[PDB]
Amino acid sequence: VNSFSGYLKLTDNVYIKNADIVEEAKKVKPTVVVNAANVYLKHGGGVAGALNKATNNAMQVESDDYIATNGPLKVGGSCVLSGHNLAKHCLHVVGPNVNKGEDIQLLKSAYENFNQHEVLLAPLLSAGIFGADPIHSLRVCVDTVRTNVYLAVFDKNLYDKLVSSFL
Numbered sequence: 112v113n114s115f116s117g118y119l120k121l122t123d124n125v126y127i128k129n130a131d132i133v134e135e136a137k138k139v140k141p142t143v144v145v146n147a148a149n150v151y152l153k154h155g156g157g158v159a160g161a162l163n164k165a166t167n168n169a170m171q172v173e174s175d176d177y178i179a180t181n182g183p184l185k186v187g188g189s190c191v192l193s194g195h196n197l198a199k200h201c202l203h204v205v206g207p208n209v210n211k212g213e214d215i216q217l218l219k220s221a222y223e224n225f226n227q228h229e230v231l232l233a234p235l236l237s238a239g240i241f242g243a244d245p246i247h248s249l250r251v252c253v254d255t256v257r258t259n260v261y262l263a264v265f266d267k268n269l270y271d272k273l274v275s276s277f278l
């Protein structure tokens with residue numbers, strides 16, 4: 112039993128809710144919140160910009176030190192950093208950004224990072240400003256993630272479309 116409330120169940124292990132991931136994290140304080148990161152951990156906009164704003168830029172400060180030490184992530188890769196005031200940990204996951212020409216096949220690799228964590232709050236990878244089809248992102252998620260994932264879809268209209276078209 113966990114504290115996630117109001118989600119629709121899609122599969123044995125995948126759940127979905129129309130919610131602002133920022134407000135959801137502040138309420139549940141999950142062990143892991145997933146960030147829709149880029150390889151430079153520059154959290155300027157989208158989910159990353161919103162999460163970082165909610166940490167009062169502490170996420171960005173920590174991320175800049177991470178990059179200075181380790182260099183950029185790989186597309187499809189991830190790193191675990193602090194969750195600041197939002198979660199115990201933030202799993203920064205880099206899905207391919209279609210608006211940069213990155214191979215959409217890397218989306219499965221990106222979701223595989225979720226399997227290293229028993230329970231996660233997460234956005235749809237490569238959705239929104241990353242330019243991929245969110246229906247496809249949900250499909251890859253369901254077919255790749257085996258751990259318990261609670262998906263927050265900010266857009267109500269997109270949420271309804273995702274549910275109504277889910278196979």
Ligand SMILES: O=C(O)C[C@@H](NC(=O)c1ncnc2[nH]ccc12)c1ccc(Br)cc1
Pocket residue numbers: 130131132133147157158161162206234235236237238239240241263264265266269
């Ligand atoms: O509309 C959607 O769900 C898709 C969209 N989501 C969010 O920007 C989002 N999601 C949840 N809480 C949030 N608070 C503030 C934004 C936000 C998205 C964009 C870029 C990438 Br890459 C991946 C997904």
